[PDB]
Amino acid sequence: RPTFYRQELNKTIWEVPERYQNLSPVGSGAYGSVCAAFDTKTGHRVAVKKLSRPFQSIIHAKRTYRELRLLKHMKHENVIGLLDVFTPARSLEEFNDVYLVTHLMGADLNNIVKCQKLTDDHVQFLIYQILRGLKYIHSADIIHRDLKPSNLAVNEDCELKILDFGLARHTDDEMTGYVATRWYRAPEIMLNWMHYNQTVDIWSVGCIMAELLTGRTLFPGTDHIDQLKLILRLVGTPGAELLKKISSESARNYIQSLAQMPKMNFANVFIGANPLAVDLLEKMLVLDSDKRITAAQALAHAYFAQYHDPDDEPVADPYDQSFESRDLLIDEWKSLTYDEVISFVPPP
Ligand SMILES: CN1[C@@H]2CC[C@H]1C[C@@H](N)C2
Ligand SMILES: [Cl-]
Ligand SMILES: [Cl-]
Ligand SMILES: [Cl-]
Ligand SMILES: [Cl-]
Ligand SMILES: [Cl-]
Ligand SMILES: [Mg+2]
């Protein structure tokens, strides 16, 4: 057990191993507080996140367990990894606090687009890395559910990592109105049409790729209905085949109230883009999720010929998510989490 030391950072007690020095506040959503630190064992600048109220309810205790399980599994060059996890507690009986440690991300996509100009070669490389990471995530039957530019870290060398997996977090207020929290979401999840699956993430990649190409948000809707009208103007209104897959009767009646529109010509929307980029966008931005291109199929598209290496696009170890259907008490979720903290093995 390392020695721990205590300090107060903005109204909060932090108790951390001596290896972590020069702690300085950076952020605080409703799920925790974050400090930057120097890790003297590894030489890395790191983010240290102290969870808030991790075991306050069954829903919160299960979310804490879910996040720790997911971060411990993800071992890929284009996905955020877990450097360390710790608690100052010396037993389950005194266990209350969880701290998560990752590499400090110095810039998101948004920061890079504002400070540098990108060529078509940059966009090939950025979208290639998102798809390489998604091939790995989907191979474990994990859905990210919240891909958007603020959830993509990018460095000076244009190297990219996916972060901030969807933990079933987002509230109704957060998704309301003229908000980037909704502009990258597939229409079947935005409107609760049907049981969604991993295809929702490919829609988000199409929206991100379009905005790297034009410099404009693809579907900047002022609300859910405005956004659906922008989507159907580009891709066309649904055919009988998709309408049958929409499980809500009211959702089906509403769509049938809209005048029919054909799919637009994507070469006339993405004026002057690489024809291979136009073709790949037409294969991602398909209304019927059954017919979208997959991450593994997209890596073999000719747009990525300069970067594709089928011997360097790895898949994940199997991931057991049977806990998602399990009914447990707060203290049972808390014990499972404690065991996962004490069994952590750091990366090479
Ligand atoms: C001018 N637009 C702003 C920032 C870049 C671009 C696309 C969206 N992310 C919003
Ligand atoms: Cl230490
Ligand atoms: Cl990482
Ligand atoms: Cl504790
Ligand atoms: Cl964003
Ligand atoms: Cl597993
Ligand atoms: Mg985020």
From Swiss-Prot:
EC number: 2.7.11.24
Residue(s) carrying N6-acetyllysine: K49, K148
Gene3D superfamilies assigned to the protein according to its UniProt record, in alphabetical order: Phosphorylase Kinase, domain 1, Transferase(Phosphotransferase) domain 1
Modification(s) after translation: Dually phosphorylated on Thr-176 and Tyr-178 by the MAP2Ks MAP2K3/MKK3, MAP2K4/MKK4 and MAP2K6/MKK6 in response to inflammatory cytokines, environmental stress or growth factors, which activates the enzyme. Dual phosphorylation can also be mediated by TAB1-mediated autophosphorylation. TCR engagement in T-cells also leads to Tyr-319 phosphorylation by ZAP70. Dephosphorylated and inactivated by DUPS1, DUSP10 and DUSP16. PPM1D also mediates dephosphorylation and inactivation of MAPK14. Acetylated at Lys-49 and Lys-148 by KAT2B and EP300. Acetylation at Lys-49 increases the affinity for ATP and enhances kinase activity. Lys-49 and Lys-148 are deacetylated by HDAC3.
Positions of post-translational Phosphotyrosine modification: Y178, Y319
Leader sequence residues: none
Protein kinase domain residues: 20-304
GO biological process: angiogenesis; apoptotic process; bone development; cartilage condensation; cell morphogenesis; cell surface receptor protein serine/threonine kinase signaling pathway; cellular response to ionizing radiation; cellular response to lipopolysaccharide
Sequence positions that bind ATP: V26, G27, S28, G29, A30, Y31, G32, S33, V34, K49
SMART domains: S_TKc
Activity modulation: Activated by cell stresses such as DNA damage, heat shock, osmotic shock, anisomycin and sodium arsenite, as well as pro-inflammatory stimuli such as bacterial lipopolysaccharide (LPS) and interleukin-1. Activation occurs through dual phosphorylation of Thr-176 and Tyr-178 by either of two dual specificity kinases, MAP2K3/MKK3 or MAP2K6/MKK6, and potentially also MAP2K4/MKK4, as well as by TAB1-mediated autophosphorylation.
GO molecular function per UniProt: ATP binding; kinase activity; MAP kinase activity; mitogen-activated protein kinase p38 binding; NFAT protein binding; protein kinase activity; protein phosphatase binding; protein serine kinase activity
Tissue expression profile of the protein: Macrophages, monocytes, T- and B-lymphocytes. Isoform 2 is specifically expressed in kidney and liver.
Active site per database record: D164
Catalysed conversion reaction: L-seryl-[protein] + ATP = O-phospho-L-seryl-[protein] + ADP + H(+); L-threonyl-[protein] + ATP = O-phospho-L-threonyl-[protein] + ADP + H(+)
Cofactor: Mg(2+)
Residues where Phosphothreonine is found: T12, T176
Annotated phenotype, changing Y178F: Phosphorylation blocked
Domain observations: The TXY motif contains the threonine and tyrosine residues whose phosphorylation activates the MAP kinases.
Family membership: Belongs to the protein kinase superfamily. CMGC Ser/Thr protein kinase family. MAP kinase subfamily.
Assembly with partners or alone: Component of a signaling complex containing at least AKAP13, PKN1, MAPK14, ZAK and MAP2K3. Within this complex, AKAP13 interacts directly with PKN1, which in turn recruits MAPK14, MAP2K3 and ZAK. Binds to a kinase interaction motif within the protein tyrosine phosphatase, PTPRR. This interaction retains MAPK14 in the cytoplasm and prevents nuclear accumulation. Interacts with SPAG9 and GADD45A. Interacts with CDC25B, CDC25C, DUSP1, DUSP10, DUSP16, NP60, SUPT20H and TAB1. Interacts with casein kinase II subunits CSNK2A1 and CSNK2B. Interacts with PPM1D.
Task of the protein: Serine/threonine kinase which acts as an essential component of the MAP kinase signal transduction pathway. MAPK14 is one of the four p38 MAPKs which play an important role in the cascades of cellular responses evoked by extracellular stimuli such as pro-inflammatory cytokines or physical stress leading to direct activation of transcription factors. Accordingly, p38 MAPKs phosphorylate a broad range of proteins and it has been estimated that they may have approximately 200 to 300 substrates each.
PANTHER family: MITOGEN-ACTIVATED PROTEIN KINASE
The protein's name in its UniProt record: Mitogen-activated protein kinase 14
Source species: Mus musculus
